[PDB]
Symmetry: C3
Subunit: 193 residues, 3 copies
């Protein structure tokens, strides 16, 4: 029928990163941020931090539906991420402009009934080093839902409790252990396996 | 056919499950499409943003015709246009919100119960309801029932030219206690009250990093 | 749709804010482009934008051909698109430049056309009309586009490599707007976002934009 993914869009000749609408297997439309530039492109970005203008210390309902701005920082929403999911790439930039990434061969979040349980594939490569497998098979947790954190390190993650905290505070935190240091830029993105 | 099925406000859009802030098209009461910036994130969301300053990349020291039609960029700073702002507030009760950020990352705000600008014939007269609350303090009530003025069309209550003296465009009285369309002066300035100023907020000598004005139906 | 064919059409239809809109190319191919509705009367289609150095412009032929970058920031629209945009009739060109002290310079030319890929996206430029940046494009008239992997210049070496850009290089250049984002004055010779008649071979601008409008 029409574009299912950012990869479809890239194959149809959309070469600039930006917000495009795609159709989920639901057939429900959704405008997403396509990264057409990184690692071959065709990535759908579901998380972005870039300047600390958006509060990421949010409750369950807010993470469920998504929040933020197409103009800047956002979380796409756990329902959308579930519908969406296919491999994972996390991109990270520090304040010295150093680039660091990690790539997982598969990435899926379950539905709300399974509390958006993270089921993550094998680490593939990445100067950032593996820091999410250790959170595999864990529900998602927000300040208004325990799960052995969210309040301790101020954020929301598949928390006993973490080795990455990308929805943490913009401290200039947004931590990746293998990578006390909060990154300038963080992006989480997906692409058909 | 799209007018009758399309959304009429950002609140409608939020109601249809649009949770990310961004530019969407809505249909004015006369059925004309208008691409607006929806703030879905702040104070429950569903706000239509008609003003935004963020980096000083756009000149806001503009004439009447330019303020009338709107100017700026969807990528950054803009004024939606006085005709559009009138169309959006002409019928019913839109509350107004003002969000301000300083260069030390202090977020401040002001909220009013209703906000309407009249049409061009009435020179976009401001009809402002009650100040509800806001950490930024009230700096708009002073401007109720004032015409809008630009450097080239002085409709203020000052014997001189407010828009020229304070280098902006606004519902100036004699002259102002707020000046959000003022120069992008970046924090403190020696020049007097000619920046993005909110008197009850950071005063007449400090120009905000971020300014946003937005409406939502009551 | 038979609708808007240019950013100027959009402006006439009452689109007053700069931003990305879709237009219909001469062949009815739809294209989403950045419209500058603010500058010099507005109605400009922007095909090049530098603003913060977040995008690598040191790219190969295929990449310049199809376009690259981001609607959120820096981009090159793509040589095929630029050709499609400028084949029929008269597009005038405006080049807008902003230094790190926020001073604006510009250059305006009466006509601007790039040929198709067979003709190596040749520069066909009209008379300089005015501009505070001076004229650093006319030197480049009637010259094939070159990238690091496709050397069509008049130098015995590879201009694109020597000045880390992609341009209508001769021997080698007087402007280099797709050069490295070097942030102001730089010791290194002429490998930044340079406009000789502007801030010279040793100053790289903060902002650069190249745009077209029906004359
Ligand atoms: C907005 O401001 C306009 C000025 O442009 C106000 O118009 C003025 O309204 C006052 C009411 O407070 C009128 O004063 C009254 O004058 C009559 C004589 O006509 C007198 O009997 C009363 O004792 C009282 O002083 C005044 O005429 C009028 N002036 C003009 C030039 O129209 C208007 O009231 C304001 N509107 C709102 C909603 O505040
Ligand atoms: C352009 O240059 C080509 C060779 O590169 C030459 O054949 C032709 O005469 C030139 N045309 C014009 C109009 O300058
Ligand atoms: Ca006056
Ligand atoms: Ca080659
Ligand atoms: Ca050569």
């Amino acid at each position: 029928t029409g574009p299912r993914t950012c990869k479809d869009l890239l194959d149809r000749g959309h070469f600039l990163s930006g917000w495009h609408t795609i159709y989920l297997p639901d057939c429900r439309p959704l405008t997403v941020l396509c990264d057409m530039d990184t690692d071959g492109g065709g990535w759908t970005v579901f998380q972005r931090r870039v300047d600390g203008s958006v509060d990421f210390y949010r409750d369950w309902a807010t993470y469920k539906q998504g929040f933020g701005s197409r103009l800047g920082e956002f979380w796409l929403g756990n329902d959308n991420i579930h519908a969406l999911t296919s491999e994972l790439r996390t991109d990270l930039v520090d304040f010295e402009d150093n680039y660091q990434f990690a790539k997982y061969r598969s990435f899926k979040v379950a539905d709300e009934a399974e509390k958006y349980n993270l089921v993550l594939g094998a680490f593939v490569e990445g100067s950032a080093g593996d820091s999410l497998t250790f959170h595999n098979n864990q529900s998602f947790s927000t300040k208004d839902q325990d799960n052995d954190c969210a309040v301790m390190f101020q954020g929301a993650w598949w928390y006993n409790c973490h080795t990455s905290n990308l929805n943490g505070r913009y401290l200039r935190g947004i931590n990746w252990k293998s990578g006390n240091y909060s990154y300038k830029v963080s992006e989480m993105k997906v692409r058909p396996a």
